[PDB]
Swiss-Prot record:
Belongs to the RNA polymerase beta' chain family. The chain holds residues 239 to 288 of 1316 of the full protein. The RNAP catalytic core consists of 2 alpha, 1 beta, 1 beta' and 1 omega subunit. When a sigma factor is associated with the core the holoenzyme is formed, which can initiate transcription. This is DNA-directed RNA polymerase subunit beta'. The gene is rpoC. Transmembrane segments: none annotated.
DNA sequence: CGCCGTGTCCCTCTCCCTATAGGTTAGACTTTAAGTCAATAC
């Protein structure tokens, strides 16, 4: 209910889907390099469970 | 007020019927490759 009432009032500004095609879109829009460097930074500085 | 260890638990691995339209095959007709005989010459 919440989802349909956001999309029919705020139809622009974003794209939202459901299912495996959405996961495929996520993998499409995913920079492996910057995320990997962020993980390197986290291991370099962070500690604990993180 | 803001994050970190210990504990418990969940999970995984191992030893009905009707009506229309169209495709398929089986069955027979005429043609052809095939088996056959008779006389002959060297």
């Amino acid at each position: 209910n919440l989802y349909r009432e956001l999309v029919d009032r705020y139809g622009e500004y974003f794209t939202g889907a459901m299912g495996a095609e959405s996961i495929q879109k996520l993998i499409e829009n995913f920079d492996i390099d910057a995320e990997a460097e962020s993980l390197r930074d986290v291991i370099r500085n962070g500690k604990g469970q993180k």
